[PDB]
């Protein structure tokens, strides 16, 4: 049993995390009360990766809910699957974080972090063999961003040889709550560069555009954005939740996807993405072409502007595994200019028999592309437009930070950008 401990922090992180557990719970046949009612043995063969088994055959998500205000976690505890979570695994304060990274990381968050670690330690102590951790959070806020990266730092200190994995929502001015989001995101990114093994980059602007342009949703809501993230999180974790050969555990996935330690920021993709013509059967060619289309990717980075270091594709449903290889090989051989030639066979494909809910088949795309530097360039440019005038810094100096820490975070992310560039022309 290779158990994974899940942590969700802050508003964004708890709303996306709640939907995630809702989606996979349905896939594994777990009802909102933790009772199994599936009809396939493949649903339970790797259930212990994410669920603990309690008395009475109950399955409890190995999840820890963290926040500095009660509001969102109240909504979770009353939502659909709210009753499925361990009551003791709700850890929250009352003051909030005011969308302030320093509050989450240095002051408000510092007061609460130890109690969160007590729950993490409890969950890990009951794992036969812990693989590692996955964290869901945003980088634009204060709790998920500032405290989330604080948790990662303290988790790595206590479990230095375990894999740390995150789903990180990147802010965008088109879907923004406050103007300080680039500050919070730049500070978090440096933490992630140093303390995570895999980070799935999810851009709120890409989620919005997909909801508007592709799904034809006139007025997207955070809820609409979160359903795309739920479906994407389910896709990337299929290799971990069902029997398979490729990317079986977190460490093997990291070894196949991360050729250099700092360049561990992935672009996820999903197919199909259909508006409500929703009953039409999709073909393997259609799945493949859409999966590799930029409009189906959720980092708002044009892959044709960079090159893939590694790619991990996952096909779900009953389909022609022979016809899967043929389309995959067709994509690589028809666009070999976008794949680095100094990593042979860097595109790996895996098949899963069980399809997502409401679909005969689907495909999930995980790319480690140098094009991701466009995402960090945007953040960096937005950071500098304000920092050059020290705008809004007083929110942060009032928590004990000084300008030097900002200058270093700015330089750290520009170094990262420079590192991606050197491999885009190699």
């Amino acid at each position: 049993m290779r158990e994974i401990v899940h942590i969700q922090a802050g508003q964004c992180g708890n709303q996306i995390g709640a939907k995630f557990w809702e989606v996979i719970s349905d896939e594994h046949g777990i009802d909102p009360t933790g009772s199994y009612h599936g009809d396939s043995d493949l649903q339970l063969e790797r259930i212990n990766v994410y669920y603990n088994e309690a008395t009475g055959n109950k399955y409890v998500p190995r999840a820890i809910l963290v926040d500095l205000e009660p509001g969102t976690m109240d909504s979770v505890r009353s939502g659909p699957f709210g009753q499925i979570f361990r009551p003791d695994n709700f850890v929250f304060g009352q003051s909030g974080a005011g969308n302030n990274w320093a509050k989450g990381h240095y002051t408000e968050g510092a007061e609460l972090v130890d109690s969160v670690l007590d729950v993490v330690r409890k969950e890990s102590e009951s794992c036969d063999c812990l693989q590692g951790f996955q964290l869901t959070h945003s980088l634009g806020g204060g709790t998920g961003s500032g405290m989330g990266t604080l948790l990662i730092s303290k988790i790595r200190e206590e479990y230095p040889d375990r894999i740390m994995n995150t789903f990180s929502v990147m802010p965008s001015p088109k879907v923004s709550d406050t103007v300080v989001e680039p500050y919070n995101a730049t500070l978090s990114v440096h933490q992630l560069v140093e303390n995570t093994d895999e980070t799935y980059c999810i851009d709120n602007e890409a989620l919005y555009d997909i909801c508007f342009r592709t799904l034809k949703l006139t007025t997207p809501t955070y809820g609409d954005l979160n359903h795309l993230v739920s479906a994407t999180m389910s896709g990337v974790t299929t290799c971990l939740r069902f029997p398979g050969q490729l990317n079986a555990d977190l460490r093997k996935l990291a070894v196949n996807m991360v050729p250099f330690p700092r360049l561990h920021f992935f672009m996820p993709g999903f197919a199909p993405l259909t508006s409500r013509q929703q009953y039409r059967a999709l073909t393997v060619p259609e799945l493949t072409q859409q999966m590799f289309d930029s409009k189906n990717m959720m980092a708002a980075c044009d892959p044709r502007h960079g090159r893939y270091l590694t790619v991990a594709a996952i096909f779900r449903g009953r389909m022609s595994m022979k016809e899967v290889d043929e389309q995959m090989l067709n994509v690589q051989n028809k666009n070999s200019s976008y794949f680095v030639e100094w990593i042979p066979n860097n595109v790996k494909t895996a098949v899963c028999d069980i399809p997502p809910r409401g679909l005969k088949m689907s495909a999930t795309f995980i790319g480690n592309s140098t094009a991701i530097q466009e995402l960090f360039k945007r953040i960096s440019e937005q950071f500098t437009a304000m920092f050059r005038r020290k705008a809004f810094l007083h929110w942060y100096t009032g928590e004990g930070m000084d300008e030097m820490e900002f200058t270093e975070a700015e330089s750290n992310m520009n170094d990262l950008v420079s590192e991606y560039q050197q491999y885009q022309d190699a």
């Binding site: 730092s153 790595r156 200190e157 230095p160 040889d161």
Partner: protein, 54 residues
């Protein structure tokens, strides 16, 4: 095309046809390698913890 060393038994036979003639580390050195790698891991992990302590 000569047949030599023809051997026959209840379960088979074997022979040789000739078409043409012609014209370590000690147990100690292995422990050092293993322990040396273990030391390099310990050193790197100590630097990481030292980094986190700062």
């Amino acid at each position: 095309m000569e047949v030599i060393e023809l051997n026959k038994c209840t379960s088979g036979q074997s022979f040789e046809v000739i078409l043409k003639p012609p014209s370590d580390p000690s147990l100690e050195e292995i422990q050092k390698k293993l322990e040396a790698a273990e030391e390099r891991r310990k050193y790197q992990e100590a630097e990481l913890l030292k980094h986190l302590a700062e």
